[PDB]
Design an enzyme around this catalytic site. Structure first.
Site, PDB file in Angstrom:
ATOM      1  N   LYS A 186      15.276   7.194  34.808  1.00 41.82           N
ATOM      2  CA  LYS A 186      13.840   7.303  35.036  1.00 41.82           C
ATOM      3  C   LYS A 186      13.468   6.836  36.436  1.00 41.82           C
ATOM      4  O   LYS A 186      12.739   7.521  37.158  1.00 41.82           O
ATOM      5  CB  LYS A 186      13.080   6.489  33.995  1.00 41.82           C
ATOM      6  N   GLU A 192       8.195  -3.992  35.430  1.00 48.43           N
ATOM      7  CA  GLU A 192       9.556  -3.570  35.726  1.00 48.43           C
ATOM      8  C   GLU A 192      10.181  -4.530  36.728  1.00 48.43           C
ATOM      9  O   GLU A 192       9.503  -5.356  37.338  1.00 48.43           O
ATOM     10  CB  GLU A 192       9.595  -2.139  36.261  1.00 48.43           C
ATOM     11  N   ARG A 193      11.492  -4.397  36.901  1.00 50.13           N
ATOM     12  CA  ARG A 193      12.268  -5.399  37.615  1.00 50.13           C
ATOM     13  C   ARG A 193      11.669  -5.690  38.980  1.00 50.13           C
ATOM     14  O   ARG A 193      11.265  -4.782  39.704  1.00 50.13           O
ATOM     15  CB  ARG A 193      13.706  -4.918  37.779  1.00 50.13           C
TER      16      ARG A 193
END
Lengths: 469, 501, 47, 483
Positions: free
Chosen positions: A154, A180-181
């Site tokens: 993704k 997210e990271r």
């Protein structure tokens, strides 16, 4: 006004007011905090109390701290002065470059455009990706989703869409990373600085950034989506522009809501998700539609827990998209990157009136052959390929050729595969798949079509493979 | 303008009244807990001071749990809730046709206001056991598979079930468009006043839909209710009953209606949210105990009144979405045991090229032979038997050869019939053309024609029949049977045409 | 309760991998012969 | 009595104490009970404070006097912890005396933002041929280790901890990697055995071991990973690289679930609280790689999860798989069929991966990846060959046998490159499949004995020079013929 904190449970603060209560969604500033702590009202517990979700860690809060009612919901800077500036959920720079000097503040909790404002036009978008441009063409100014579990691709796919469409796109752009990271945060930041879309010298930046990366409390991951969405909404309406809006993930938004729902005293729904999943997602995913005042092309990376597309989160999100490209792990472990599933993927503009007979029938031939190959695999499992028919082996070979041909070496994947990025204009994808289906390449080996751009590269690769034979 | 503003101001209602009232104790998640309102009827419309509405749903002994019809950002602990005394009701009539209304019958189309005269409740009871009369007339959907193998009479609930993106809304919209031929003609015993309730869809989807309908000029007889994804839970829970009341007006006014719920699995989710927030006990999959009463009392209004109550009708095509063919989930089984049939759609069929992706094995209609015209009955009986025979031995298809010539014939007939059932999008066909095509199909006038070409034939044949022998088609249509003369004429046309191609 | 098409591979059981095995024999051998034939062709075209 | 600075217990039970008073107690602040114990004011209700006792509450009675300390929980940090076993709070339990630290640090602290971090570039030599080659790990990268019970997960961790002895005894300081091992929910016997096997390798002179074993009250198990991560953040901030191995993390999720179901907070999925994501993300997002304006430190994290019956699609395994930068899928099927360590390649990704590796090892690992991928495409043939297919099967068997490795015997990167280069260059495809092992072993000694110059050249230059390649090939052939 000014209230007091009466309870602090987890990341939910109950504040008691003696003056007039603040309406729901207001912003409250907790006093005496070294870093600005902003609570959002979310209930009125009765007895002149409110319950609020905190946008920062609640360490150090003391029962009785004084809390100032701001007056209006979380307000964030907007304008062309937020371009190339990373922002918190509450619009305060986190790039150590000084305040965001703007003239317009916008409140994140707005309303969706009414039915009279909807724009009913749609026309294909060219992303330069074979599978996407062929079987699931992306409508310009239409919501787009990138489903698929973890580790399928993704983020790489959104990196490709940013690399291609962003620079080649006139109007501004926004990237609102939700939960997210944090590593990918500066990876994107540095990549964009290198590309020049963000400049730290001139006011020629094209991409605004918003980040609620997953180290933030759940209260601040359910709202950063609205911050990025607000910035893009301003660039659509007030600036009279066309906008790209990338979100990744947009499942951490529903998860972040689920994390605090229980503490707000709510019975838990089907799979532990909050009872209000569908409407909390609707009130957000319906401020992203294109309208008659401007256009937003929204690309959203939707997680899928354990690759289960039946889960309530993706199962609900499926109704809020035009084009849904369902990355699959079964196809990513064959080396077919992008991992897109040619059969689960869908688009609203795959009607011959909008892509024409050639493209539509090429796509439907591809889908038919892939499905027939799936049907045959059941037999090949028992027989073995030799005992097959003679007209079938042809279809299996063609399906394998097509399946390999849908892969492609991305410009950002130069570090994974060591290949060179390839783009393929739509007409060329149609030509190549027409030729493969018609059998004009039935003599070439299958490994000739693996990780190549236009079909001519396939024939060149077939040569170079036969030379070393 | 200005001069118009004068009467816009004048045309108001400044009068006041002595009304009851209770004050909000609490609010949050879209659920007010009003205190007071001692004389408030259960399921009644109260109004908050700010301007919102609410439906006083949960009369607890000390407080009344009201559900707001919108964002409660405008409501605060302390606001005033004034009751109206009137159960939820909606406008009705023939003024709505061609408009787009929201869950409460308020034109969200711009395009001026609704000029309806008579309103109507939303929680009425279905007609009893005596008013109804057996289902006899057909509802031509214009889709070959639906209209021949799984028929749909007028007054029948016919679930349209299937996974995501298999073409359920497409079937419903083909059905809506097909009614144009009747609704332009003369007879009032064949005019269907389609309705389309859009629940949980995003406004872009409903906009594209009304665009499709307007292009085909199918709005002059369609209402389009819409409780879209952003509208608070009560407006999605309540839209189907608004649609069903708009249709009940026609039904009890001696007219024929048709109402399409899309989805009915996004109304049950909204009702689940409402209940779980009101704190009512949960059940399986967290749905309350009413998620059967909910649907049942809705899909049981689709009746076919007798000739003493008018002769009206109200079909119903609730679209349901099943998670990966899990027909055993709670809502799919709740709504499969209420309705009179099911049109199952599958993706294995959708991508094999069988579009519309109807799965005739699982699809059934419990009226059956009735709800068909004698002509279509004659053709479809043989077609259905042949297709069942083909399905029961289609497992051999991949071999075909090495087998008895009888099963080879069965496969060579089933493949042709399957290819004939394939249909385009938004291209419904009158019943006579369907009868002609399926007659040319089931009598063996294609067995010697390679499958890949059948579709071609079909189209060509229609062009060669509509432009040439409209008299024969009229003869079939006016009396819906195939008299031996008509049978022989069809045979001659089929044979000579096939010869000429 | 029912089944689907192309599901002997999704299970990833013994047959799900034996099927990959069989297909990979057939098409590796076909690729070998096709490469040899393409070589032969280009080498002939030197004349 | 002073209800502002001191409250009285109301109802102690099962580990959680309600405390009436303490009107000026901060959230997650550490209250000291009168009996030497300590707590953590977690729930701040309008009337009483829900505190969690860091120990067994035999000694707590209703009516006792709880007095706040005035500081959010914190643990000692510094160079003075190295080679010590400490409790989850920072109290030495190895009987070596006072811990003796000159600096505390909060546990519930915030991970570095977007700007401090810089891309992951250096390699963190694990010493396991199957990891350095295929699923490499870089400094500043978080790399899950997920597998069923008893598949060799703590073996990966201890091999990693032992291997760093090559660098920690060298002159350089940009290569030194101190290690921290957080043991949640284990046995005291297992932790003692681990410490003994570390001491036998003299790898405790640069290691810490935070121990929250099975008996220690649930709050200590819930707090051990944060204590370890703070002890490591101290090194990360100060420009010294570090490492940390939570072992396991699922046990922390269980401890948190208990601690949160006893505070009467409602449950979620599988009875876990709603936050078991924000519990692990808050933790793992601290493993950073600070840029050169912030020191250049790092903190590699190696969370270890245990799936139940090889169920990667469970709740917590999928909560952590989506937080980390890769995976190392230990399979319990490969663990019997012969492959030890059971690392399952093809499923084991490293979303950073190649950039971390060292050029020398990259040269050979690039080719090995493709060769093994092709082999695994056609490795499914005990069922039943062509020349090319037969060669591929043979080469795959050779490489697989090379990947296997002993236990607690990490091998330097130069030796790994030597062996892998031997295998991937076709200088094995004639040996018996079961011979490789002995050959491999024996081969090492030879190259360790005579050709220390060549290995030193590869190690120092970081790549296989053409001269290096020639000498390596000569050694391989002169040995194979001498084999």
């Amino acid at each position: 006004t000014t209230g007091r904190i009466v309870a602090v449970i987890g990341a939910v603060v109950d504040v008691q007011f003696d003056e007039g209560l603040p309406p729901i969604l207001n912003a409250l500033e907790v006093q005496g905090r070294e870093t600005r702590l902003v609570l959002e009202v979310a209930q009125h517990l009765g007895e002149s109390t409110v319950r609020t979700i905190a946008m920062d860690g609640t360490e150090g809060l003391v029962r009785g701290q004084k809390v100032l009612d701001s007056g209006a919901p979380i307000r964030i800077p907007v304008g062309p002065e937020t371009l190339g500036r990373i922002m918190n959920v509450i619009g305060e720079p986190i790039d150590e470059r000084g305040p965001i000097k703007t003239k317009q503040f916008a409140a994140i909790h707005a309303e969706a455009p009414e039915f009279v404002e909807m724009s009913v036009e749609q026309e294909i978008l060219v992303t330069g990706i074979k599978v996407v441009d062929l079987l699931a063409p992306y409508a310009k100014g239409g919501k787009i989703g990138l489903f698929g579990g973890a580790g399928v691709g993704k983020t790489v796919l959104i990196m490709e869409l940013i690399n291609n469409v962003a620079k080649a796109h006139g109007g501004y752009s926004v990237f609102a990373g939700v939960g997210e990271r944090t590593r990918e945060g500066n990876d994107l930041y540095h990549e964009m600085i290198e590309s020049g879309v963000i400049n730290l010298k001139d006011a020629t930046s094209k991409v605004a950034l918003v980040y609620g990366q997953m180290n933030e409390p759940p209260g601040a991951r359910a709202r950063v989506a609205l911050t990025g969405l607000t910035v893009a909404e301003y660039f659509r309406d007030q600036e009279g522009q066309d906008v790209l809006l990338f979100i990744d993930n947009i499942f951490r938004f529903t998860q972040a809501g689920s994390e605090v729902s229980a503490l707000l005293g709510r019975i838990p729904s089907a799979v532990g998700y909050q009872p209000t999943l569908a409407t909390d997602m609707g009130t957000m995913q319906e401020r992203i539609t294109t309208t008659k005042k401007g256009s937003i092309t929204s690309v959203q990376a939707i997680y899928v827990p354990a690759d289960d597309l039946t889960d309530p989160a993706p199962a609900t999100t499926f109704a809020h998209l035009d084009a849904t490209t369902v990355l699959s792990r079964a196809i990513a472990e064959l080396g077919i990157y992008p991992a897109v599933d040619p059969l689960d993927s869908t688009s609203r503009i795959m009607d011959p009136n909008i892509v024409g007979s050639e493209h539509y029938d090429v796509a439907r031939g591809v889908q038919k052959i892939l499905q027939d190959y799936k049907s045959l695999q059941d037999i090949i499992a028992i027989l073995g390929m030799d005992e097959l028919s003679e007209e079938d082996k042809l279809t299996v070979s063609r399906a394998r050729k097509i399946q390999r041909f849908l892969s492609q070496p991305f410009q950002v994947a130069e570090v994974f595969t060591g290949h060179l990025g390839k783009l393929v204009p739509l007409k060329e994808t149609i030509k190549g798949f027409q030729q493969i289906l018609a059998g004009e390449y039935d003599h070439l080996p299958e490994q000739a079509f693996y990780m190549v751009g236009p079909i001519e590269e396939a024939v060149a690769k077939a040569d170079k493979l036969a030379e070393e034979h | 303008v200005s001069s118009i503003l004068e009467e816009r101001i004048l045309g108001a209602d400044t009068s006041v009244d002595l009304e009851e009232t209770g004050r909000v104790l609490s609010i949050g998640d879209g659920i007010a807990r009003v205190h007071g309102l001692r004389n408030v009827q259960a399921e009644e419309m109260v109004e908050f001071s700010s301007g919102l509405k609410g439906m006083s749903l949960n009369l607890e002994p000390d407080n009344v749990g009201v559900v707001v019809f919108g964002n409660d950002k405008l409501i605060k602990e302390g606001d005033i809730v004034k009751r109206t005394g009137a159960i939820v009701d909606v406008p009705v009539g023939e003024e709505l046709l061609g408009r787009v209304v929201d869950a409460l019958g308020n034109a969200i189309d711009g395009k001026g206001p609704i000029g309806s005269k008579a309103r109507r409740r939303v929680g009425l009871k279905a007609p009893g056991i005596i008013p109804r009369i057996s289902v006899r007339e057909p509802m031509q959907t214009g889709i070959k598979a639906v209209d021949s193998l799984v028929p749909i009479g007028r007054g029948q609930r016919e679930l349209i079930i299937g996974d995501r993106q298999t073409g359920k809304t497409s079937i419903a919209i083909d059905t809506i468009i097909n009614q144009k031929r009747f609704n332009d003609g003369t007879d009032e015993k064949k005019k269907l006043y389609c309705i389309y309730v859009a629940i949980g869809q995003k406004r872009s989807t409903v906009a594209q839909l009304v665009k499709r309908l307007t292009d085909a000029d199918a709005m002059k007889y369609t209402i389009v209710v819409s409780a879209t994804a952003s509208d608070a839970a009560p407006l999605q829970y309540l839209a189907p009953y608004s649609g069903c009341s708009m249709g009940e007006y026609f039904r009890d006014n001696g007219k024929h209606a048709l109402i399409i719920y899309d989805d009915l699995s996004k109304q049950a989710v909204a009702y689940r949210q409402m209940s779980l927030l009101l704190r009512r006990p949960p059940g399986r999959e967290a749905y309350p105990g009413d998620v059967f009463y909910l649907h049942s009392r809705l899909l049981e209004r689709a009746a076919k009144m007798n000739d003493a109550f008018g002769g009206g009708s109200l079909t119903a095509l609730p679209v349901i979405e099943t998670q990966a063919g899990d027909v055993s989930a709670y809502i799919p089984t709740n709504v499969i045991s209420i309705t009179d049939g099911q049109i199952f759609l599958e993706t294995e069929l959708f991508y094999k090229g069988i579009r519309p992706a109807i799965n005739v094995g699982l699809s059934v209609s419990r009226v059956g032979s009735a709800a068909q015209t004698r002509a279509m009955k004659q053709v479809a009986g043989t077609m259905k038997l042949e297709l069942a025979q083909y399905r029961e031995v289609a497992a051999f298809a991949q071999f075909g050869s090495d087998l008895d010539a009888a099963t080879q014939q069965l496969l060579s007939r089933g493949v042709r019939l399957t290819e004939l059932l394939k249909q385009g999008q938004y291209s419904p066909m009158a019943i006579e053309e369907q009868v002609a095509v399926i007659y040319a199909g089931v009598r063996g006038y294609l067995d010697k024609l390679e499958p890949s070409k059948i579709t071609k034939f079909e189209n060509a044949f229609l062009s060669h029949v509509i432009s040439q022998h409209q008299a024969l088609l009229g003869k079939i249509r006016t009396d819906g049977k195939i008299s031996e003369e008509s049978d022989a004429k069809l045979k001659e046309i089929v044979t000579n045409f096939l010869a000429g191609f | 309760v029912r089944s689907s098409a192309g599901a002997v591979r999704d299970a990833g059981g013994a047959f799900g991998k034996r099927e990959q095995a069989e297909e990979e024999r057939y098409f590796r051998a076909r690729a070998k012969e096709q490469l040899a034939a393409l070589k032969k062709h280009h080498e002939n075209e030197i004349s």
